[PDB]
Amino acid sequence: KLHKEPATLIKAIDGDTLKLMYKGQPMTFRLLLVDTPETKHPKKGVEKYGPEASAFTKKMVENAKKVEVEFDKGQRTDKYGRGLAYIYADGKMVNEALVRQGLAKVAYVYKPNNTHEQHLRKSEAQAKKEKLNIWS
């Protein structure tokens, strides 16, 4: 069963990337299963809704009493040494909130790291129906 472990925000870097203190180590985390528009993007620079996605993650996590990380059951770090996880701000999953607000798309999913894929997909369908942000 997946379980939550506490973490301390160091710095929000982008819509989908954060630096956290995890078990005494500063580490970069990449939000599992979501692609947000980018500000630090390799070739196009600032994509549309990039700044908004980034402000949302920043606010959500900065304003939280408690931040927790949830590892899936596959690999826990990617080729760049970033943590792969579901991030919770006061019990609320950041990855899903971004999708529900139309500020992220569900990513190409890699088994076995896909436990909350259906949940997220259901939030994505909804945001699209509501024609929010990315979907407007």
User: Exposed, middle or buried by CB within 10 Å (0-12, 13-18, 19+), for 52?
Assistant: middle
Residue ranges for the known binding site are: 16, 35-36
* 100: annotated active-site residue: no
Residue ranges for the known binding site for Ca(2+) are: 16, 35-36
- The pair of structure tokens assigned to 14 is 């982008």
Identified catalytic residue from 52, 70, 82, 121 = 82
| β partners of residue 21 | 8, 26
* 47: annotated active-site residue: no
Identified catalytic residue from 30, 68, 96, 100 = 30
* 38: annotated active-site residue: yes
* Ramachandran class of 118: left when φ > 0, alpha when ψ lies in -120 to 50, beta otherwise: alpha
Q: Which residues are catalytic?
A: 30, 38, 82
